[PDB]
C-alpha cells in the first residue's frame, strides 16, 4: 500500500506516446548508519535468508554487508570499482577488505563466512569490460541463490552492458535449481537498457517487479528490478512487446511523480 511496486510484466498507447510521456515525467522529476543499505533491504521485503551471493558493482560494499549480517549469507563474491591502499591491514585471502566489511572479519576467522573479493588492481573489476567474466569466472561461485548488480551511472546512459554481465552469469555459471533472486539497480531514464532487460533477462523469470524504495531519491529515475522464479523451460519469446515495456516504464514514472508531489522520501 505504501510500498511502490509495479509488475515489470504480467488497449495501450503507441511507443511514441509512451516515449513522449516518459520525457515529460523525467523533466517534472528533475524540476520537483552510513553502512546500512536501506534501499536493498526494502527490495528484499519478501525474503529473510540467502546462502550464496554474487554482488556486482558494489561500491563501498553496503549491499554485501546487509546480505551477510541480516540475510545470513555464508559465501559471497564481491565485485567493486573501488581499489584499496596497500597499507590497510585487514585482508581476506590476500585481498584488502573494504572498510564497510571490517565488522564481518571475525566471521571469516571462525571459518563461518567465505568472502571472495574482486576489488584488486591486479584483476579486471569493471563488469562492463568484455573480458571481466573470463578473468573472474573461476572465482565466482556457481551455486549463487542471489545475484545483485548495484551500479550507479549518470541518467540517460545505456546500462545494457551492466545487465549483460548478469545475463552472462545466469546463462553460463549458475545452478538453475538454486538461483532464487536477481536484483538490478536500474534507471528509468535509460529506455535502451530497460528494453534490453525485457529482451534478454526478463523472459528467463516467471516474476519481475520494479520497486522504488522510500529511501530512494524522489528526483532520481533510480528503481530496482527484482526478478525471481527462474523458469525451468527457456522461453524463445519475450513476456511482452517493447511497446508494453515502455508503457510499464511510463506507469512507474507516473507513480513516482505522484509520490514525490505528495512529498514523501526518507533519508534523514
Amino acid at each position, epitope marked *: 500500500p505504501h510500498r511502490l511496486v509495479v509488475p515489470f510484466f504480467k488497449i495501450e498507447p503507441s511507443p511514441e506516446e509512451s516515449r513522449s510521456n516518459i520525457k515529460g515525467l523525467l523533466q517534472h522529476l528533475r524540476t520537483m548508519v552510513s553502512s546500512m543499505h536501506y534501499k536493498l533491504d526494502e527490495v528484499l521485503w519478501e525474503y529473510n535468508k540467502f546462502e550464496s551471493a554474487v554482488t556486482l558493482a558494489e561500491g563501498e560494499g553496503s549491499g554485501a554487508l546487509l546480505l551477510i549480517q541480516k540475510y545470513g549469507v555464508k559465501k559471497l563474491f564481491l565485485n567493486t570499482l573501488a581499489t584499496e591502499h596497500s597499507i590497510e591491514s585487514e585482508v581476506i585471502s590476500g585481498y584488502t577488505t573494504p572498510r564497510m566489511l571490517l565488522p564481518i572479519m571475525p566471521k571469516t576467522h571462525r571459518g563461518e563466512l567465505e568472502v571472495i573479493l574482486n576489488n584488486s588492481a591486479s584483476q579486471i573489476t569493471d563488469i562492463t569490460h568484455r573480458d571481466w567474466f573470463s578473468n573472474q*569466472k573461476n572465482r565466482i561461485p556457481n551455486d549463487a541463490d542471489i545475484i545483485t548488480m548495484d551500479a550507479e551511472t549518470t541518467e540517460n546512459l545505456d546500462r545494457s552492458r551492466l545487465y549483460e554481465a548478469v545475463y552472462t552469469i545466469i*546463462c*553460463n555459471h549458475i*545452478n538453475p535449481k538454486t538461483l532464487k533472486v536477481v536484483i538490478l539497480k536500474v534507471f528509468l531514464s535509460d529506455l535502451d537498457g530497460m528494453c534490453w532487460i525485457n529482451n*534478454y533477462l526478463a*523472459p528467463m523469470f516467471g516474476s519481475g517487479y520494479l520497486i522504488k524504495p522510500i529511501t530512494s531519491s524522489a528526483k532520481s529515475s533510480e528503481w530496482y528490478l527484482c526478478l525471481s522464479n527462474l523458469l*525451468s*523451460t*527457456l522461453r*524463445t519469446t519475450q513476456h511482452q512487446t517493447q511497446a508494453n515495456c515502455l508503457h510499464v516504464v511510463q506507469c512507474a514514472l507516473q507513480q513516482q511523480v505522484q509520490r514525490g508531489s505528495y512529498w514523501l522520501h526518507h533519508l534523514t
Partner: nanobody
Amino acid sequence: DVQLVESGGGSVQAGGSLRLSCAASGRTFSRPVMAWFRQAPGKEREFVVAITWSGIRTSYADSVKGRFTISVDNAKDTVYLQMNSLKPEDTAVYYCAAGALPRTAHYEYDYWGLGTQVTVSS
C-alpha cells in the same frame, strides 16, 4: 568469435540411436544459447532444441518429443544431442549453433558448425 565442431553422425538402422557432440571454443560465454538445428534435402533449417551453458533447456520440436535429448558438459564446452528411435524422416544434416538469445529462427544465430550428416535407413 566462437568455433563449433559437430561429430557423432553417420549411417544408422531405423530404430537405432546416435549421440551427436558439438565441441565449442572461443568466446562461448558471449553466445551462451546452444541450439541444434537440422536440414533435410530441399527443406528449410528446422529448430530441434536449445540449452544455455548453465543447463536451461527450451521445449523440444514436436517432431522429436520423447526421442531426442539435449545436454551439456560445461567444463568440456560440449553440448550433446541424444537421438533415439530414429526413423528415415530424421535423415538430415544436423548443425550446432551458438546464439546470444533463445530463438527458434536459424537467422538469430551468428555462429554455426559445418554440420554432421545423419542417414537413417528404412
